[PDB]
Amino acid sequence: NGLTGTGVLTESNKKFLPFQQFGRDIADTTDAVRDPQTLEILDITPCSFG
Amino acid sequence: FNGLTVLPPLLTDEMIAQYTSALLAGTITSGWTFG
């Protein structure tokens, strides 16, 4: 929905309040999103590196 | 995780505790001679 980024997406157990669209924790980094069709919360983690 | 990583220390906590225990036993049994 216009928010772009790379990573790997999994199921999550967070409970968004019925009007938010995504979430961030500290230093403003997105961690979870809500798919506009299924209306479920998905969790984003970066692709592995080192 | 934004290109930054944290590396683990070489010595784990059990080894540090073991060193401290060895030092304490040495000073408690042999005086200062073991130094």
Add this chain to the structure above:
Amino acid sequence: SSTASALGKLQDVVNQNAQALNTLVKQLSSNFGAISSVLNDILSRLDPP
């Protein structure tokens, strides 16, 4: 066991390191005079030259 704040030095070291990392990672959201703080948008919204 009872009294707290007896280990101020180690806590101070940890807090200083964490704060330095936090401010460094937060500095990623500043324009520095450019039109946007995100690189993908300026890539996909404006002429390369």
